[PDB]
Amino acid sequence: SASNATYTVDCEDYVHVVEFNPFDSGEAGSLLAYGGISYVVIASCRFQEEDSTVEGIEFKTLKTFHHGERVVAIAWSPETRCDALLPLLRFATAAGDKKIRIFTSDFQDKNEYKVIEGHSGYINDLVFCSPEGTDIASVGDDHTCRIWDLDGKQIAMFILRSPGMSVAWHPEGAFKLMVAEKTGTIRFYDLTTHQAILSLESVQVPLMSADWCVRNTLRIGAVAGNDWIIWEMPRSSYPQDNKPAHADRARMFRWSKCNENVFATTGYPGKMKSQIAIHHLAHPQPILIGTAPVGSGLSWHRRLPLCVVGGYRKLFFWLTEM
Amino acid sequence: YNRVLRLLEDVGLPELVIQLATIAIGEASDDWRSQAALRTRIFKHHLDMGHNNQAYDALTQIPDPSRQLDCLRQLVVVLCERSQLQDLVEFPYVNLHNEVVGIIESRARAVDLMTHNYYE
Amino acid sequence: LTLLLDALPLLEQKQVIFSAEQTYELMRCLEDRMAAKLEQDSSIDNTKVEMLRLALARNLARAIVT
Amino acid sequence: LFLTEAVVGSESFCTDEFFIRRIHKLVTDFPTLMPMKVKQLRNRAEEDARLIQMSMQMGNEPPASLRRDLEHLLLLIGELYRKDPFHLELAL
């Protein structure tokens, strides 16, 4: 049974990637960056569950950034804040031109961007690989993982054996970076000694996405082929749990930021509507199965049990009842 | 390109269908028939998604007059059902104001009085 | 007539006040008044009538719409 | 704040001379034995107040997280030495 989106927000163009702000900005609302065909819109999302005063969802676009290229991945910066005294809006966006654009703003007039070049292959995923927000890691189809600072200089380059699909920073432990290669070999790289700490293996191929669990650092989740896969460390490289997620192909894996048992997997934009299957570790079947016409981009709300999938000119929010 | 278009139709990705259809229009530079087919497909998908203005533009671009007229009828019917009559009013009529009048007239003289809102 | 003039800007306002049926009742009153009347001002009242009708019809459309 | 409102708030505190003497001993042992910390905190509070007030004067309102411990301290001094039943002139 298809679940209707709890909240649906109309947009100006197809959303290619939607990302909530996982860091505290100092404001009541949770920031949302959705990147479309030629733009990156920063918005603020206040929900009914967060505040009773809000009826439904209070969606307010704060700042629109002209990108010029299709945004394929967005990474929020730890320094992002909406403090009245000192506002800072920093985020890194990769595009379909193998380039990283760091947009630094103050929410008032000042708008600065920096093109970082170097990748010879399309960047699939990028994240800020620093607690202070100084470094940005980007993985791509050139079989390389490159660490870039704020000034656009490569600090380190890790040669992968497969196109890097998803890069993720360790929630608590410092200097640990997870790179998920497309052949299923997810590796952990030290950012101090620049050496591969460990290499996990997925039973199925291709590994399309991987995410850490903020609540439980040990639990690592990923989507290889049609089945979702969970690993738990320091135990084994073998999948602990492996159950079918989608019939066609599973594309994006995102852990819940409020619960260590809930995770969402999005189906691949293809013959079927891009379905979302919010699974639960205890329940064999997904707790919520919703359908989005064409959906790309998945992110979880920092405090609420809510996820977002960017559909065609729309934003679909699904609330998972805990 | 048409093969991929049929794929994307069953695939249910309307936007991809539209852009690829535009690229295919370019390849069929001299073939009015193929141009008309693809433009008709574009109009259809736009109408299905609620993109009234884009649908109307695609309609005004179809080289074949018969296809254009049938598409016009379909658009009129759909807008009536969705109660988007304001846009219908805004859309000008290519000497087919009377045609629209006649379509609705026939619908009325053919439907039960206590059920439909065509008359209104 | 004064009550009808007041009803006029009420119809005119962007947010429709009178429903379709209410405007039809006003029409009936106007027609009944016209009959009884028989048994400048005129120009303004005819313009009033026309605007009234236009607004009522637009509201009726919006109702048939809604 | 506790001292100012609950200890001196008692009208029977005006009685015993040794209560006032011990309290004054604590109050003057604070900036005599550890004045470095006191100065650090005075400068910190002054600067925080200035920054946050001046930034708010632009268009904003003062945040709820403000703690004017210096104002409470000055009020405490005023309230401690306000009353004189023992003719000590302890303010010397």
Curated annotation (Swiss-Prot), chain C:
<comment type="subunit">
    <text>Component of the nuclear pore complex (NPC).</text>
</comment>
<comment type="similarity">
    <text>Belongs to the nucleoporin Nup85 family.</text>
</comment>
<comment type="function">
    <text>Component of the nuclear pore complex (NPC) that seems to be required for NPC assembly and maintenance. Involved in nephrogenesis.</text>
</comment>
<protein>
    <recommendedName>
        <fullName>Nuclear pore complex protein Nup85</fullName>
    </recommendedName>
</protein>
